Amino acid sequence: FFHHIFRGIVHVGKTIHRLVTG
């Protein structure tokens, strides 16, 4: 399903972008 799959990809996506400049 794809209901609350983008809610957990928030901390993730943010993570990468958090280490992007890393």
From Swiss-Prot:
Disulfide bonds: none
Organs and tissues of expression: Expressed in mast cells in gill, skin and gut, and in lining blood vessels in the viscera. Also in intestine, spleen, anterior kidney, and blood cells.
Domain of life of the source: Eukaryota
Modified residues (Glycine amide): G22
Cell location: Secreted
Function in brief: Antimicrobial peptide with broad-spectrum activity against Gram-positive and Gram-negative bacteria as well as against a variety of fungi. Rapidly inactivates channel catfish herpesvirus (ED(50)=4 uM) and frog virus 3 (ED(50)=13 uM) over a wide temperature range. Seems to disrupt the membranes by adopting an alpha helical conformation and forming toroidal pores. Has hemolytic activity.
Family: Belongs to the pleurocidin family.
Name of the protein this chain belongs to: Moronecidin
Organism: Morone saxatilis (Striped bass)
Entire-sequence positions represented here: 23 to 44 of 79
